[PDB]
Amino acid sequence: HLCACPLRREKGFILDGVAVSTMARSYEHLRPKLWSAIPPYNAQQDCHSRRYFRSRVVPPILRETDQDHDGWIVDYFHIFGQGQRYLNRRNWAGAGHSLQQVTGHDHYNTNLKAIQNGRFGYRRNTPALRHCPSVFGEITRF
Amino acid sequence: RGQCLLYNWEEERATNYLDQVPVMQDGSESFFFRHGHRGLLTLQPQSPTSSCTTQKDS
Amino acid sequence: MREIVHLQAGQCGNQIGAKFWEVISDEHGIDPTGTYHGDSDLQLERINVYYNEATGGKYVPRAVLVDLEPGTMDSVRSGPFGQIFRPDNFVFGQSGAGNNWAKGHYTEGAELVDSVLDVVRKEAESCDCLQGFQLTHSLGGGTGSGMGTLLISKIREEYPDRIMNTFSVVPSPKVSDTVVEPYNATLSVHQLVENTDETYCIDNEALYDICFRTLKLTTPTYGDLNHLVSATMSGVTTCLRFPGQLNADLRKLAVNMVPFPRLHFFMPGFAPLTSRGSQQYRALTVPELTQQMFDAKNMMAACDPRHGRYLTVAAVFRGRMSMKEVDEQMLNVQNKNSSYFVEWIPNNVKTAVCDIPPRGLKMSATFIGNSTAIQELFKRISEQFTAMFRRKAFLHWYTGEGMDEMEFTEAESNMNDLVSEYQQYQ
Amino acid sequence: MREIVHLQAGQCGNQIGAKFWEVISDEHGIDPTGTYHGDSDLQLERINVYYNEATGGKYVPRAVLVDLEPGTMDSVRSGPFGQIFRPDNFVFGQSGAGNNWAKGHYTEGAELVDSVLDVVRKEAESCDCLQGFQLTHSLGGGTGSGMGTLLISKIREEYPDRIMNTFSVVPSPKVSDTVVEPYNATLSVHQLVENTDETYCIDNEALYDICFRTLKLTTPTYGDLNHLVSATMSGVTTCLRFPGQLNADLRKLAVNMVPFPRLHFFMPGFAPLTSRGSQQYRALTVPELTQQMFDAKNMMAACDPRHGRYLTVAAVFRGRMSMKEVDEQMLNVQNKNSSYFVEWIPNNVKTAVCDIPPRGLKMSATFIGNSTAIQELFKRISEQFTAMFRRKAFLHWYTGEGMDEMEFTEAESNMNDLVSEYQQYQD
Amino acid sequence: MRECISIHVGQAGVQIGNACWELYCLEHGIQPDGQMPSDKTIGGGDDSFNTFFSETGAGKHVPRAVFVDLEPTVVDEVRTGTYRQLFHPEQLITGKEDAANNYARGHYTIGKEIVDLVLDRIRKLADLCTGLQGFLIFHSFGGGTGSGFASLLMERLSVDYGKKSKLEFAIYPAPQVSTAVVEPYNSILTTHTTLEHSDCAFMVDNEAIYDICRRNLDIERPTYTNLNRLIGQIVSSITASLRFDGALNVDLTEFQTNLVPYPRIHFPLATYAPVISAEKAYHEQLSVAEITNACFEPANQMVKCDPRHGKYMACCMLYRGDVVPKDVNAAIATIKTKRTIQFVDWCPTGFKVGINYQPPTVVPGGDLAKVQRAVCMLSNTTAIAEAWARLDHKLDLMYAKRAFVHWYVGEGMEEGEFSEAREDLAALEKDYEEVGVDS
Amino acid sequence: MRECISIHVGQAGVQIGNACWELYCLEHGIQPDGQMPDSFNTFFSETGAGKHVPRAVFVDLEPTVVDEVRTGTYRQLFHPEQLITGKEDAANNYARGHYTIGKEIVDLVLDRIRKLADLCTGLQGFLIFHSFGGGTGSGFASLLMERLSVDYGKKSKLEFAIYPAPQVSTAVVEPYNSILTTHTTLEHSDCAFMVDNEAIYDICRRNLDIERPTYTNLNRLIGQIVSSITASLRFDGALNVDLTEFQTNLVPYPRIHFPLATYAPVISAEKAYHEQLSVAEITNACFEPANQMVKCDPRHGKYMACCMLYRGDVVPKDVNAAIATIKTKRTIQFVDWCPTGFKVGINYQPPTVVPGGDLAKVQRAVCMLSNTTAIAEAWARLDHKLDLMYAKRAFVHWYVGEGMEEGEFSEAREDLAALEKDYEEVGVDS
Numbered sequence A: 001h002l003c004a005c006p007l008r009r010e011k012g013f014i015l016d017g018v019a020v021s022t023m024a025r026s027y028e029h030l031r032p033k034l035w036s037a038i039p040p041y042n043a044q045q046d047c048h049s050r051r052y053f054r055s056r057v058v059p060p061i062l063r064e065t066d067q068d069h070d071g072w073i074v075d076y077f078h079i080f081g082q083g084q085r086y087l088n089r090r091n092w093a094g095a096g097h098s099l100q101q102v103t104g105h106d107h108y109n110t111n112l113k114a115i116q117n118g119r120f121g122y123r124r125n126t127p128a129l130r131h132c133p134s135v136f137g138e139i140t141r142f
Numbered sequence B: 001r002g003q004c005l006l007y008n009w010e011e012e013r014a015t016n017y018l019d020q021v022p023v024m025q026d027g028s029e030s031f032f033f034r035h036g037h038r039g040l041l042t043l044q045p046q047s048p049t050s051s052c053t054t055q056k057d058s
Numbered sequence C: 001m002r003e004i005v006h007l008q009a010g011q012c013g014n015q016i017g018a019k020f021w022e023v024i025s026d027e028h029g030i031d032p033t034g035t036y037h038g039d040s041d042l043q044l045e046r047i048n049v050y051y052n053e054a055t056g057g058k059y060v061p062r063a064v065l066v067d068l069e070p071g072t073m074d075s076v077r078s079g080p081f082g083q084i085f086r087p088d089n090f091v092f093g094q095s096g097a098g099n100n101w102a103k104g105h106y107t108e109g110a111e112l113v114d115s116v117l118d119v120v121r122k123e124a125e126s127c128d129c130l131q132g133f134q135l136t137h138s139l140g141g142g143t144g145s146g147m148g149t150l151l152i153s154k155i156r157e158e159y160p161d162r163i164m165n166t167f168s169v170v171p172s173p174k175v176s177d178t179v180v181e182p183y184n185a186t187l188s189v190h191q192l193v194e195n196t197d198e199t200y201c202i203d204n205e206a207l208y209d210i211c212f213r214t215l216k217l218t219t220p221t222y223g224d225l226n227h228l229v230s231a232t233m234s235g236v237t238t239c240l241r242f243p244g245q246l247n248a249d250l251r252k253l254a255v256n257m258v259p260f261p262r263l264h265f266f267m268p269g270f271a272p273l274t275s276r277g278s279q280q281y282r283a284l285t286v287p288e289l290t291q292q293m294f295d296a297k298n299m300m301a302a303c304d305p306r307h308g309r310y311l312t313v314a315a316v317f318r319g320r321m322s323m324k325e326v327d328e329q330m331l332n333v334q335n336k337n338s339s340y341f342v343e344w345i346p347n348n349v350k351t352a353v354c355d356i357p358p359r360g361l362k363m364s365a366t367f368i369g370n371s372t373a374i375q376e377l378f379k380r381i382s383e384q385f386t387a388m389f390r391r392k393a394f395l396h397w398y399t400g401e402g403m404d405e406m407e408f409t410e411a412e413s414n415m416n417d418l419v420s421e422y423q424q425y426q
Numbered sequence D: 001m002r003e004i005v006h007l008q009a010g011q012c013g014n015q016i017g018a019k020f021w022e023v024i025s026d027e028h029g030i031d032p033t034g035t036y037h038g039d040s041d042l043q044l045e046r047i048n049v050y051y052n053e054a055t056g057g058k059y060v061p062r063a064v065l066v067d068l069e070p071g072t073m074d075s076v077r078s079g080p081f082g083q084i085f086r087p088d089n090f091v092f093g094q095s096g097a098g099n100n101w102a103k104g105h106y107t108e109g110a111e112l113v114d115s116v117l118d119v120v121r122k123e124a125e126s127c128d129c130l131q132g133f134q135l136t137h138s139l140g141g142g143t144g145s146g147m148g149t150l151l152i153s154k155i156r157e158e159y160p161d162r163i164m165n166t167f168s169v170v171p172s173p174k175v176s177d178t179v180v181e182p183y184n185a186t187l188s189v190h191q192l193v194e195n196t197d198e199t200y201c202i203d204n205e206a207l208y209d210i211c212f213r214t215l216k217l218t219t220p221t222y223g224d225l226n227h228l229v230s231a232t233m234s235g236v237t238t239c240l241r242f243p244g245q246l247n248a249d250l251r252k253l254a255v256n257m258v259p260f261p262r263l264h265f266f267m268p269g270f271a272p273l274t275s276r277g278s279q280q281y282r283a284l285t286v287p288e289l290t291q292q293m294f295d296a297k298n299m300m301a302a303c304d305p306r307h308g309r310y311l312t313v314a315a316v317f318r319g320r321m322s323m324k325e326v327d328e329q330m331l332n333v334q335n336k337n338s339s340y341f342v343e344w345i346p347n348n349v350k351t352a353v354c355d356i357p358p359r360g361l362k363m364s365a366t367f368i369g370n371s372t373a374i375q376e377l378f379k380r381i382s383e384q385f386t387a388m389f390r391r392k393a394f395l396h397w398y399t400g401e402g403m404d405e406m407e408f409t410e411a412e413s414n415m416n417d418l419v420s421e422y423q424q425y426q427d
Numbered sequence E: 001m002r003e004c005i006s007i008h009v010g011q012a013g014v015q016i017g018n019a020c021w022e023l024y025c026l027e028h029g030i031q032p033d034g035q036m037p038s039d040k041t042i043g044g045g046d047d048s049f050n051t052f053f054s055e056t057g058a059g060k061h062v063p064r065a066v067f068v069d070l071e072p073t074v075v076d077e078v079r080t081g082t083y084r085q086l087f088h089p090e091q092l093i094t095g096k097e098d099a100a101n102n103y104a105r106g107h108y109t110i111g112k113e114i115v116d117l118v119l120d121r122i123r124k125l126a127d128l129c130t131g132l133q134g135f136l137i138f139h140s141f142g143g144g145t146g147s148g149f150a151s152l153l154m155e156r157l158s159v160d161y162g163k164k165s166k167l168e169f170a171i172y173p174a175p176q177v178s179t180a181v182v183e184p185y186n187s188i189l190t191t192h193t194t195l196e197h198s199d200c201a202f203m204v205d206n207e208a209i210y211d212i213c214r215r216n217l218d219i220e221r222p223t224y225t226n227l228n229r230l231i232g233q234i235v236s237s238i239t240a241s242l243r244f245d246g247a248l249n250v251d252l253t254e255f256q257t258n259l260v261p262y263p264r265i266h267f268p269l270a271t272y273a274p275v276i277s278a279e280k281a282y283h284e285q286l287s288v289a290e291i292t293n294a295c296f297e298p299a300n301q302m303v304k305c306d307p308r309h310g311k312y313m314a315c316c317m318l319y320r321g322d323v324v325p326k327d328v329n330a331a332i333a334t335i336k337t338k339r340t341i342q343f344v345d346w347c348p349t350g351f352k353v354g355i356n357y358q359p360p361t362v363v364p365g366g367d368l369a370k371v372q373r374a375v376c377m378l379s380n381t382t383a384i385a386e387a388w389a390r391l392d393h394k395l396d397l398m399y400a401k402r403a404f405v406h407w408y409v410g411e412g413m414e415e416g417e418f419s420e421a422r423e424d425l426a427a428l429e430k431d432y433e434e435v436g437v438d439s
Numbered sequence F: 001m002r003e004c005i006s007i008h009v010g011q012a013g014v015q016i017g018n019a020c021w022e023l024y025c026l027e028h029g030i031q032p033d034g035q036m037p038d039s040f041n042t043f044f045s046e047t048g049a050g051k052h053v054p055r056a057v058f059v060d061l062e063p064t065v066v067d068e069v070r071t072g073t074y075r076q077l078f079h080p081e082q083l084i085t086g087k088e089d090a091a092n093n094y095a096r097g098h099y100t101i102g103k104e105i106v107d108l109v110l111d112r113i114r115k116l117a118d119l120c121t122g123l124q125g126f127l128i129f130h131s132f133g134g135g136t137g138s139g140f141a142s143l144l145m146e147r148l149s150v151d152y153g154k155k156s157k158l159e160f161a162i163y164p165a166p167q168v169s170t171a172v173v174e175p176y177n178s179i180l181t182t183h184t185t186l187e188h189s190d191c192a193f194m195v196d197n198e199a200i201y202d203i204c205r206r207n208l209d210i211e212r213p214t215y216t217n218l219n220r221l222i223g224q225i226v227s228s229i230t231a232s233l234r235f236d237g238a239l240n241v242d243l244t245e246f247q248t249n250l251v252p253y254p255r256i257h258f259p260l261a262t263y264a265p266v267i268s269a270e271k272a273y274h275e276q277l278s279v280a281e282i283t284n285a286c287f288e289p290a291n292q293m294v295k296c297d298p299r300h301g302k303y304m305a306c307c308m309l310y311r312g313d314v315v316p317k318d319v320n321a322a323i324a325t326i327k328t329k330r331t332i333q334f335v336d337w338c339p340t341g342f343k344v345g346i347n348y349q350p351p352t353v354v355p356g357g358d359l360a361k362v363q364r365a366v367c368m369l370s371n372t373t374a375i376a377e378a379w380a381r382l383d384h385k386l387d388l389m390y391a392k393r394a395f396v397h398w399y400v401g402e403g404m405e406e407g408e409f410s411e412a413r414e415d416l417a418a419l420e421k422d423y424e425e426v427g428v429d430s
Ligand SMILES: Nc1nc2c(ncn2[C@@H]2O[C@H](COP(=O)(O)OP(=O)(O)OP(=O)(O)O)[C@@H](O)[C@H]2O)c(=O)[nH]1
Pocket: D245, D247, E010, E011, E012, E013, E015, E016, E069, E070, E071, E098, E099, E100, E101, E102, E139, E140, E142, E143, E144, E145, E146, E147, E171, E178, E179, E180, E206, E224, E225, E227, E228
């Protein structure tokens, strides 16, 4: 999937915030709230608050509270739901699939077909202008 | 402006009423609209500003 | 309330400031005569930030217009908003700079800086409290590049705790306007790293790209690019003039933006930009502002932050919006593409929400972004500088005015330090 | 958007192009001073196909005028529509060819061919996208038949993507206004068969037959002859310039017209030709137009399609008609006349409908016809070439400019093979 | 909540969309400029326009469609016509040059530069819809753009959305009359790529609607504008249940579940019962019993093929207007007692019904009478296999002596796809032979 | 107030200044009488009766060419004292115009220039019009630009000279005075805009379709070039370029100050309205070597700096988009030590037409000045023409009897040899 072919650090800015707002609209009409746009903050899976969560006296409170490995079915819908599947299917190409939206400002004047009477001048459509392009003469050699 | 359909013909045929040079000698859209075009950011340029704040509506 | 002193230097600075004060006067409902013709009381409750009060219910400028040519004073005085400006704020010499930074800073910018300093001192002593100073200029010239930095140095000498700002039209990537433009740009950036708390880089090729694709208009003048620049010039001082749920001044944005005093170069942008023929079809929502908010074809500097990575991001929002949705959008844009944000700091986006939008626009948003991809501008500038310096080209127009040769080299060293120091945070 | 570039070489091509720029400027509402003066806004929409812009809204044609002798250009510059042409697009020489293929291809067109290349590259690269090169000339002349072929060879070497449109005035059987035409016509049609996409053969005897019985004209002049083929040659490219319910550009009338690249010689016509004293004695309907399409008295080539077949056929309808009436007319003509159509191609008639009738009619059409009965045009030319070759009639006028006899022999070897392939697909 | 997105490809596609979107704008209260009349204010609860129209900020309704064509000659008529302020400027995607009845150009060279733009626009339009559940493809089999570019489009849409349903409405060639000499080539080649990349393929024929217009209506010598309105009517009846309340609402995935038995059988027939003028319907007391019966007659079909010599496999009725289920059941029971209508052995019931509470609408001009009820039957039958039995005869005649192939091999196309498209068609017509065998 | 004062020395000077001041009166409201029926005061000065006198000084040593001005319709426009005439000619002799006859005319010319500058509160430039191959334009103009450097110092003095043509020359001793007027001014000048008569002959032959032009016909186009070089002084524009701009921004070294002038749209009124004169085609018109005012091919050399000035329908976006089109063709060439290369100047005022002139009424005009290393062939040809006739001391005895000596020939020859070595050294990449 690299038909656009920019520099490969491009095509990866994702840049879709209206998609996560248009699929939160699905559960406005639904009564069972399953997929929202805020993901849950599970401190176990979180890579930030592990200092408290690897020290002592934590496993005695984990097994007895039925949390040892704000909702359980919401995680199943967050990582298996049709909203997340649609979100991931449209995120394989980070930027757009077109050359216009992957372009920043470095592809502004790139093609730029130059156009140029004659080629270096010297109109000679008149045959008096072709037998000689100057009544005085021409110098050098080109 | 836009009568022949060559390059960017939709936009100014939809925008003759905003960029009509009145009449003068020469009279291009360079000495006219030198100090700014008309309706660049907002097509309704004279609607009054909203007097609604957060606390004055809640 | 804190009032802001505006300064314009050179032809580019004066032409930008004319359009800027035009759009400020429309946003506050001030006619070209100078009286008040607005509809809301919110427009007059904090008009003292930019406008001094006169007799007769008319409002008088807090702005200084400086150039070495008298020919550009007639151009702004005869402009569409030209009669509003104070006659004592026009400071001007007789002979021009010549796109020479040397006489723009040493020979001819020296006898003129006393008059400008007298004007600034005479008018900023009338403050109750003063926040800082704004300056619009260009680095590829002789007036706004030369004396635009000497002025910054002298106000830094006088008031050190105020907020010096800069909206500088940086030199272009592809086609230049002056051949000695790399010299002036290199010599001006060297004075802009120790004397400005914030500085915005504006490039004309970026604005050309906006006016070609996004605005879709085929014959744009300099007024349209000036309007685009001034849409974000006013977009950073909204919370000083209109109330909101989450205010943010320039000092707060500077504090939340720059982590060290040598990275204060930004990339501005404006959200609700679309063509006139397709304007009434766009459904203005906060996600739709976010979608082309962070798009890098909606930048005013001719770099690409997708190439590098974001040290921080600002977002000043105007209009009716939900507080959950702005944090939702500015957390989604952080969380999805985690390779474009620095990781030695938890969050990068600054949130600011105002609720008085521009006239006729339901919502709007303004961008300030600091990235490590801005090093490509100084890299190219220094490459051209050292290509032009090893042959001693155009040098006698600098050295003959009372200026030594090593002052080029120490500026090159400072800019190279800036280039190599930005690489540490990639 | 799909621009064309008009080329015309020699006296015949110059007069034909002059009449063409009369009629198509009258159609688009172009005043002879170069200003638009019409009624509808649909004429200005697609005016770029044949015209360019200027300063102040003037419309100059994208036509390149060339001949070796300026005896014709200065007559068409001072004519009715002479001041709209670009004054630099006229390019010429001192000494003309004079009914010789040799000089205008090897010694006098060889130093003027770069001139037309200069002008055609300047006009070609300034447009957005090109979709054809139009050439009008004659095959019996010397500065059109020889220089035109060299021009097509030099242009097709540079743009193999685009399409070549040629309107060659093939000589008539009973008429010979140039004695050395079996040499020039053969050498011209040797070079045409390898470079052009579609060739429209026009015979002047068929034009005289049209003005004789079809139009009831007592004084048929050469302007009357030029207007008749100019109507068709402006009716071919209608669908580019006007909206339609079924559009067909030059490429559509090439993909759906030639089954093989060496079989591309066409045979045009134009229906609604009746006398002004015989106009209301017949209604203007689709069956009448389709009958007078396929009638033997209404085509501009002097060949009769009874002794041949029809590989494929195009006909661009133009005006305000229905669709299924057209389908009935172009299905029943294949049903009854099945013995005069090829059987290995299921349908042969390609149809296209525009919605803007010409200025002054209700509904019109235009015939484009690939027939295997066009090989009778080349049988006569091969016979007359062989008659003038054994005695070497005017041959010394051709060797004096850097030629040789094996070029003539290979031109004949191209012609007998083209005729043989047409005959092999006749059965 | 039940959004659908339609894609119109080619001149045939955009001209079908021209007469179809006026019907859509007349089902709801949408003015030709895209506004509400502001005199008929609707309740805030109902969202009948949300299936086809997207609500913008102030009051404007912008349709969910893509008009894409390689030429500018027909879609510039759209934005200079009487509906120019209704469509988005960027939903009208136009190329620069056509394909000229060439599969090679539109699938390999001239269709490949603007496939990215139309993909980006479809993605941008799909980022606003919530319950995306269908795709409508309007193109032409016998064209160059509508056969080549559309094939690339639904070759590339499947890799983007995956299992989403793809219903298509294509103009199949006619046996007697036609338009071009080369459309057998462009019709066999599209059978290879849209067979496995589409879910249900409704096909229409331009000559079968001609006899409907001559015989049912009294519209003599009709143009295309009198033919595209029938396509608008049938396509509105199919998606009628998605926006109007009814007794038996039939969702989009319910159509395919009992319309296709086998994965390679998605080619049903199409018909519309009360196609009648005002004069003839004024004197005719018809009923449910023979608007049900008229759709089973061979002369009322929109593809030239008799169902007399072909087994029915899965019929799907849709009813509009004032319809109670009892006379529908009675009419269906009277279908079961007819001998001349035959059914396959493995289908016990073979009938799907759906009742809607909205009568069909009428347009300014036009010729259709305003009737209370209408029937749109999507009959999946085996008799459509003989429609392919003429097109394959249309191919090998030109394929024997290599005619027009040189226009294909030059533009990025190798010869080896005629010889596999023909074998794909042979396997497809064997697949329909297997299902008709008694066992 | 952005005044500049012009000095016209010699026959070429006065016959160019006549066309120049006719154009200046035409695009202002100034009648030839002087009365009227943006920024005006740069070239004219008000009086108590509404008269607008100019600020130019006409200098020649023979009265046959200024007395024609004194009796025409511009008799009451120019100041009576600002037209300076001698009694007898310099006689095509550099020594006569430098040492014997020009020694006592400078006391009047300097007084007149000082009188001009005392009413000039914003003086920022000098313009000197002369010819390299004359006796007054070679000798007296060299004395003037020697002395103005001492008297006025760091004022910008840019002179518009006429190089002798590479092939044609109306005189014979021209490569003597042309050599001697360069060595004595290379340290006394800032920028030298230079035109040849032969290239303008070719342009008026092939661009304009006229045959047999007159010196006034060339002077119309020459004065139209100068009207576009001081257009930004007089009229407001989006990008003003003053007279002191050119020397900072065009010459890299204080020895080489010789650019070449070029006017892009030159076309007859009968052919103007059949073309498309867009920005993409008029900025390209300054680069094909048939359109240059100096008959030298830039294909040999490499461009050092360029300065393009625009008029009329500018719209600065496609100026950038058309300059960027120049970078993609490899036939154009640039030095490696000037990676930027170009200058952009934009003015709103469209060019005006003269009654009887061969030019058309257009809305876009480009006047481009560029210094190129390809000018080294002009100096090489003048080099060879000097040592072809100095090798046997051809016309030397005329010069040595008029207050000069033999060493001034050899010193000037060595000076131009050093200049040619400089031009050869510049054109090396690395
Ligand atoms: N029913 C119906 N059929 C149409 C309509 N327009 C065109 N067609 C059919 O479409 C077929 C070919 O049209 P296109 O799809 O445009 O063929 P194409 O090669 O794509 O032509 P271009 O679009 O110009 O490239 C014809 O045989 C017509 O029968 C229409 O409006 N209604």
